């Protein structure tokens, strides 16, 4: 017998491969597995990890987010890397010329980038151009802006978006939501 100080046979709790059966995603994972093993590039390791992420853990990155990241000082000529989808954003009117590497480009995002004069490349093209992640800028979309997230941690005095099907007057607004009816929250 052993007095165990920790749970036995505990899985790491991190993905070691994509749940997806996408053969092309698996090819990208194989390439970046080789790169992360045999380059000692932290970029390669983080890209390999990001290739495993689920859909909610790869929120889309808009071209406006990319443009703000390029407005960062000294980052204007860096290749922007999004392990996920790059979406279009018409709220921005001045997109700069740049190289973006992404898993997927929306038609509109690709059109905007090409029109601004840059290029949209895949992650294997990124790997060939920058095997050590040279001159890269990894961008990630907003995870906690998901609609599901605003209902997390619901409770008294939390302000956390009750799970509700119909909204308006008569729908969870009277007793427990105002001092005039019992109490508030």
């Amino acid at each position: 017998g052993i007095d165990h100080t920790s749970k036995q046979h505990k899985r790491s709790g991190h993905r070691t491969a994509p749940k997806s059966d996408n053969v092309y995603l698996k090819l990208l994972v194989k390439l970046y597995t080789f790169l992360a093993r045999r380059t000692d590039a932290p970029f390669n390791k983080v890209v390999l990890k990001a290739l495993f992420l689920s859909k909610i853990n790869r929120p889309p990155v808009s071209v406006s987010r990319i443009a703000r990241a390029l407005k960062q000082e000294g980052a204007a000529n860096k290749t922007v890397v999004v392990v996920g989808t790059v979406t279009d954003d018409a709220r921005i009117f001045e997109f700069p010329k740049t190289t973006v590497a992404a898993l997927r480009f929306t038609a509109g995002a690709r059109a905007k980038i090409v029109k601004a004069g840059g290029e949209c490349i895949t992650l294997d093209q990124l790997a060939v151009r920058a095997p050590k992640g040279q001159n890269t800028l990894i961008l990630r979309g907003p995870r906690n802006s998901r609609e599901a997230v605003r209902h997390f941690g619901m409770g008294p005095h939390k302000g956390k978006a009750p799970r509700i099907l119909s909204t308006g007057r008569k729908f969870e607004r009277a007793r427990g939501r105002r001092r005039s009816k019992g109490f508030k929250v």
Partner: protein, 183 residues
């Protein structure tokens, strides 16, 4: 030390030897029915299995731990011979959270060389003389997995104090006989 004792006796004095700086502790109790404070102390001394043993540097902070775990351990003052045989036969290093036998001085140098410990004898020296890097060397040493004593425990019942004819507590110099039988 021998000459100091002889000289004090010749001068009509008594040479009080320095208090022991090192103890070897062996958990002699199983893992069932242990109160939480002694259980936590045994975990913190890395004695999570019966007949698992570790070296402890003696301070007030660790003597108050030995006091708490007294009914579950047999401990005492290890000799050079005991330490040498323990490290040579059952010396394992904790390398990358893995238990690696100390079969070559290169292993010891690769993991403890930054502290000046280049070989198994350097490790043993850092253990027996509680050196500046005793904490690091002792922690690098995986807890020793001893067997049951080859000639038995010498007593009918292990779980009264050594003073009361049992096995636990401070058996100060007889820990060498016990550990040599268990090693």
């Amino acid at each position: 030390i021998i000459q100091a004792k002889r000289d004090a006796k010749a001068a009509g004095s008594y040479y009080v030897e320095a208090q022991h700086k090192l103890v070897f502790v062996v958990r002699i109790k199983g893992i069932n029915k242990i109160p939480p404070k002694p259980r936590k102390v045994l975990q913190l001394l890395r004695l999570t299995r019966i007949n698992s043993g570790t070296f402890v540097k003696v301070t007030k902070a660790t003597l108050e731990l030995l006091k708490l775990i007294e009914p579950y351990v047999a401990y005492g003052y290890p000799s050079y011979s005991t330490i040498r045989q323990l490290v040579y036969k059952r010396g394992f290093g904790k390398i990358n959270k893995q238990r690696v036998p100390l079969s070559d001085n290169a292993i010891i140098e690769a993991n403890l060389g930054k502290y000046g410990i280049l070989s198994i004898d350097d490790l043993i020296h850092e253990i027996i003389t509680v050196g500046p890097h005793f904490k690091q060397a002792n922690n690098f040493l995986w807890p020793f997995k001893l067997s049951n004593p080859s000639g038995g425990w010498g007593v009918p019942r292990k779980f009264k104090h050594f003073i009361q004819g049992g096995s636990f507590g401070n058996r100060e110099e007889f820990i060498n006989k016990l550990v040599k039988s268990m090693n």
